């Protein structure tokens, strides 16, 4: 196991970033699913 003492710390951060990398990114994903003029 990782640093068992301050390993939960990371998840209060790196998690925020995914809810914007799969929420704002999802709009980037919709505009790039044609393969016609990427």
């Amino acid at each position: 196991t990782p640093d068992v003492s301050s390993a939960l710390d990371k998840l209060k951060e790196f998690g925020n970033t995914l809810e914007d990398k799969a929420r704002e990114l999802i709009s980037r994903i919709k505009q790039s699913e044609l393969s016609a003029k990427m």
Side-chain angles (χ1 to χ4, degrees), residues 19-31:
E19 189 31 59
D20 240 19
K21 256 53 186 221
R23 174 279 195 144
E24 307 166 332
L25 167 120
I26 262 149
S27 148
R28 170 197 276 276
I29 277 338
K30 50 99 67 132
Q31 222 206 135

Side-chain angles (χ1 to χ4, degrees), residues 2-18:
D3 199 340
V4 49
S5 162
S6 323
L8 205 271
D9 166 32
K10 212 209 263 214
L11 297 280
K12 250 84 232 225
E13 171 44 87
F14 156 118
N16 152 64
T17 295
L18 181 76

